Amino acid sequence: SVQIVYKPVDLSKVTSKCGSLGNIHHKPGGGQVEVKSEKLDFKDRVQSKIGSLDNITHVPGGGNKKIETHKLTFR
Amino acid sequence: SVQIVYKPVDLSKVTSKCGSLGNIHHKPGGGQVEVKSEKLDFKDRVQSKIGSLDNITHVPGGGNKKIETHKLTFR
Amino acid sequence: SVQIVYKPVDLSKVTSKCGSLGNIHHKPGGGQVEVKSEKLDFKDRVQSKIGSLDNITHVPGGGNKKIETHKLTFR
Amino acid sequence: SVQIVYKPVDLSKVTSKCGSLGNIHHKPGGGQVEVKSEKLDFKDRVQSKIGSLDNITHVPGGGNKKIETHKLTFR
Amino acid sequence: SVQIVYKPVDLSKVTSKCGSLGNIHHKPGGGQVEVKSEKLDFKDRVQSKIGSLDNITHVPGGGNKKIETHKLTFR
Amino acid sequence: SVQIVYKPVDLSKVTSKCGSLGNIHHKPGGGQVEVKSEKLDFKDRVQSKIGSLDNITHVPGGGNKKIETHKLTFR
Numbered sequence: 227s228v229q230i231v232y233k234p235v236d237l238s239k240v241t242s243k244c245g246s247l248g249n250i251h252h253k254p255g256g257g258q259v260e261v262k263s264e265k266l267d268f269k270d271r272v273q274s275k276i277g278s279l280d281n282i283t284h285v286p287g288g289g290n291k292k293i294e295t296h297k298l299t300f301r
Numbered sequence: 302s303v304q305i306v307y308k309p310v311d312l313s314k315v316t317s318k319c320g321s322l323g324n325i326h327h328k329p330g331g332g333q334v335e336v337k338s339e340k341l342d343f344k345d346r347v348q349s350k351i352g353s354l355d356n357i358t359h360v361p362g363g364g365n366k367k368i369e370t371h372k373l374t375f376r
Numbered sequence: 377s378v379q380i381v382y383k384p385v386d387l388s389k390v391t392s393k394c395g396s397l398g399n400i401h402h403k404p405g406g407g408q409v410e411v412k413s414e415k416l417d418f419k420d421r422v423q424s425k426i427g428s429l430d431n432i433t434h435v436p437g438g439g440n441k442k443i444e445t446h447k448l449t450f451r
Numbered sequence: 452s453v454q455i456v457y458k459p460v461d462l463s464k465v466t467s468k469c470g471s472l473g474n475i476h477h478k479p480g481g482g483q484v485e486v487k488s489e490k491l492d493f494k495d496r497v498q499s500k501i502g503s504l505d506n507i508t509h510v511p512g513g514g515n516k517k518i519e520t521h522k523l524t525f526r
Numbered sequence: 527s528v529q530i531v532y533k534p535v536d537l538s539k540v541t542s543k544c545g546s547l548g549n550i551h552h553k554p555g556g557g558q559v560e561v562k563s564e565k566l567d568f569k570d571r572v573q574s575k576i577g578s579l580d581n582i583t584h585v586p587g588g589g590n591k592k593i594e595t596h597k598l599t600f601r
Numbered sequence: 602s603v604q605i606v607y608k609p610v611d612l613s614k615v616t617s618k619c620g621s622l623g624n625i626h627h628k629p630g631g632g633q634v635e636v637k638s639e640k641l642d643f644k645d646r647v648q649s650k651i652g653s654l655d656n657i658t659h660v661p662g663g664g665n666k667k668i669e670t671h672k673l674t675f676r
Binding site: 471492 | 602603604605606607608609610611612613614615616617618619620621622623624625626627628629630631632633634635636637638639640641642643644645646647648649650651652653654655656657658659660661662663664665666667668669670671672673674675676
Binding site: 302303304305306307308309310311312313314315316317318319320321322323324325326327328329330331332333334335336337338339340341342343344345346347348349350351352353354355356357358359360361362363364365366367368369370371372373374375376 | 377378379380381382383384385386387388389390391392393394395396397398399400401402403404405406407408409410411412413414415416417418419420421422423424425426427428429430431432433434435436437438439440441442443444445446447448449450451
């Protein structure tokens with residue numbers, strides 16, 4: 227009496243070519259950091275970070291993404 | 302009596318060529334940071350960061366994305 | 377008695393060529409930063425950041441996106 | 452009583468920077484050279500140079516001298 | 527009593543920068559050269575140069591001298 | 602009483618930086634050279650040089666001298 231057919235089809239490409247990929251950092255400086263605290267009070271958690279230089283460097287040789295999500299649902 | 306036929310089709314391309322890809326950072330300075338605090342009262346969570354230089358560098362050799370979502374739903 | 381047929385078709389391209397792709401940061405300066413606080417009160421979560429130079433650099437060798445959403449829905 | 456205190460402070464910098472130094476993406480490119488020579492007669496000294504590119508950096512200068520003299524004398 | 531104090535402070539910078547220094551994307555491009563020579567007679571000294579690009583940098587100068595004398599004397 | 606105190610302080614810097622130094626992506630490129638010679642007669646000394654690229658760096662200079670004298674004398 228009833229049929230439900232979920233037959234989606236994906237042939238897609240997510241692609242790259244690239245030549246030379248380069249990153250250079252040449253001398254960065256984090257300068258002086260100074261902190262002074264007196265009579266502070268806290269009543270739920272403290273999350274902290276202190277520092278002269280914070281660096282993140284992500285250099286993927288193709289950083290390509292495919293996200294697919296499929297739902298068949300009854301509620 | 303009833304049929305439901307979910308048959309979408311995807312041949313799509315998301316693509317790049319590239320020659321040389323380069324990034325240069327040449328010398329940045331974060332200058333002096335100074336913080337002074339007295340008698341602060343905090344009643345819920347504290348999330349903090351202090352610092353002279355904060356760098357994020359992201360250099361994907363092709364950073365291409367495909368996002369697709371498919372729903373067949375009854376409620 | 378009833379049929380519903382969902383057959384969309386996608387042949388799309390989203391594409392790039394490129395020659396040389398280059399980014400140069402040459403010497404930036406974050407100047408001196410100073411903060412003073414006295415007798416502050418806080419009653420819900422506090423999110424803070426202090427710093428002389430904050431840099432983000434995203435340099436994709438082709439940063440192409442395809443976003444598609446397909447819904448068949450009964451409620 | 453008598454007190455004599457000779458205490459000069461030198462924190463000076465004397466700096467020389469000569470020649471090519473901090474260039475970024477310097478790409479000197481010499482094109483094609485052709486020499487065809489026929490039936491030439493040389494009756495005295497020949498000094499000959501042929502070529503696409505000379506990329507010479509040449510520094511007879513850039514030298515420093517610091518001369519500094521100190522005297523304390525009672526006579 | 528007598529108190530004599532001699533305490534001069536030198537923080538001076540003497541700096542020389544000569545030549546090419548901080549250029550970005552310097553791309554000198556020498557064209558094609560052709561020399562055809564036939565039946566030339568040289569009865570005396572020949573000095574010859576042929577070429578597409580002379581990317582010479584040359585620094586006889588840019589030297590420094592600091593001369594500085596100090597004297598405290600009682601006579 | 603008598604007190605004599607000779608305490609000059611030297612923290613001074615003499616620096617020379619000469620020649621090629623801190624270049625990034627320096628890519629000198631000498632193109633093709635061709636030399637054809639026929640029936641040339643040389644009756645005296647020949648000095649000959651052929652090539653695509655002379656990437657010479659040459660530093661007769663960049664020397665330092667610091668001359669620095671101290672005298673304390675009673676006579």
